Structure 1
């Protein structure tokens, strides 16, 4: 009984176990910590993957399964799968420190990337560093929501960050017209530099390509572009950072 050895009676996988209290009785299900967290967060996940065990258990730690009768008398349905989803969204998932640390580092890294690659600061539009955004986030006692989407957290972080460092997001479209020859040097440069869209070139003629970049990459762009064009090509602006996305004056 005791001891628990995966080489005699039961193996007991290391799957994620979620528990939920309802009707007085406690239920548990074997699911994936990654699929469960992403599912509850609001990600269209499949039960065939998030649920390792398509059956409402009771004592997964020991290997005790529930009953269909009690399942319907406790939740009002026999669909063990449905009940599992409920516990996955309402119940609590049991994960080790590693499972929590891994998700934290990943989430933190993403936020720092989007803020460092898709955001600037009120200082000569100098792109901030991931280490800078991370430090400030921690210094301001900021706790990421691993049980939610990063996008939604962007507002909370970008707003709170204002206290330490004013961080804002801004996009912009670029348009460059290079000659026949000079166009061969610029194009190859813009390609890797950033997203290249609306590219039109003629046989032994000038090429007209537009470059899309945030309010941080614009620096490296204008730099390399100007140095690559050498007052030989033309550059027109497409979009401009202006408050006209959702609200104009309200």
Structure 2
């Protein structure tokens, strides 16, 4: 019986558990929560600092120490320090709440920054400001996601901001050179559908066009072209920060 003479207990960890499934076998390690991030940020603070223990476990939560056969088979080596290091680099890493929040914060900044790269242009000396966008994002409220990439998130959320309202971003000139015969055809379809500028049809000197996108919507402008005539004689790609010749759009 238990109730009389010790009724017994369970015990909980407070140590990070870096985990990786190789060959269908979970290996884990013993590290702390606010070191395992710092290792990967180029803060080489001795490996013996980040490791609380140098050993590998099948499950470090209970405490089942890992086997030599399992190790060598799964890593191509039985030496443990190296394996531990590998785990630290590669495997999923548990983190604290504060640590998690930091990442989120960083992401928030990033998604503002990406919006700031190309902003609204009356001339070419106005906004390009990160802060305002960030503020807007904060005040509209949306779930910032670590699985979601930053650029994608920005793309998603700018739409929302648009109907706040707040006008954002500026377009650039991705330039092309079409053929003589097919160029005309392209022009016939692409004129009312999307904005097309610097159009000059010729019999001998080919046709030049400039499809309007910010770089982040270059799949939609080209798809039609691909469908109709394929690739051009030359296809000009420019940077996603400035249009090479100063932006004047939106």
TM-score bracket for this pair, using the shorter chain length:
0.3 to 0.5
Q: Deviations over 1:133-187 (max 9, x none)?
A: 3256679999989799999999999999999999999999999999999999999
- Preserved CA contact (<8 Å) 2:113 2:130: yes
1:249 Cα deviation after fit: 22
Q: TM-score normalised to the size of structure 2? A: 0.42
Relative distance call for 1:140 and 1:240 in structure 2 (3 A) is: closer
- Judge conservation of contact 1:119–1:216 (CA < 8 Å) in 2: no
* Corresponding residue SS for 2:17: strand
Contact kept, 8 Å, 1:137 with 1:161, in 2: the verdict is yes
Residue 232 to residue 198, structure 1, CA distance change in 2 (3 Å): closer
For 1:236 and 1:22, how far apart are their aligned partners in 2? Answer: 44
1:66 Cα offset (Å): 1.5
TM-score w.r.t. the length of structure 1 is 0.42
Moved more, 178-187 or 78-87: 178-187
Q: Report the Cα distance in structure 2 between the residues aligned to 1:157 and 1:117, rounded to whole angstroms.
A: 15
* Structure 1 range deviating more: 239-248 or 211-220: 211-220
Q: Distance in 2 between matches of 1:227 and 1:22?
A: 44
DSSP-derived class of the 2:4 partner: coil
8 Å contact from structure 2 (residues 115, 133) kept in 1:
yes
> CA deviation digits over 1:186-244, x for unaligned, max 9?
99999999999999999999999999999999999999999999999999999999999
User: For the Cα contact (< 8 Å) 1:115–1:130, is it kept in 2?
Assistant: yes
Question: Residue deviations 1:3-53, cap 9 Å, x none?
Answer: 999999896652211111112221111224444335446665642233222
CA contact (8 A) 1:174 1:239 kept: no
The question of whether the paired residues in 2 share the 8 Å contact of 1:37 and 1:147 is answered with no
Question: Structure 1's 249 and 165: CA in aligned 2 closer, same or farther, altered over 3 A?
Answer: closer
Q: Which has the larger radius of gyration?
A: 2
Aligned 8 A contact 1:172 1:239 in 2: no
Mapped partners of 1:73, 1:226: distance in 2? 49
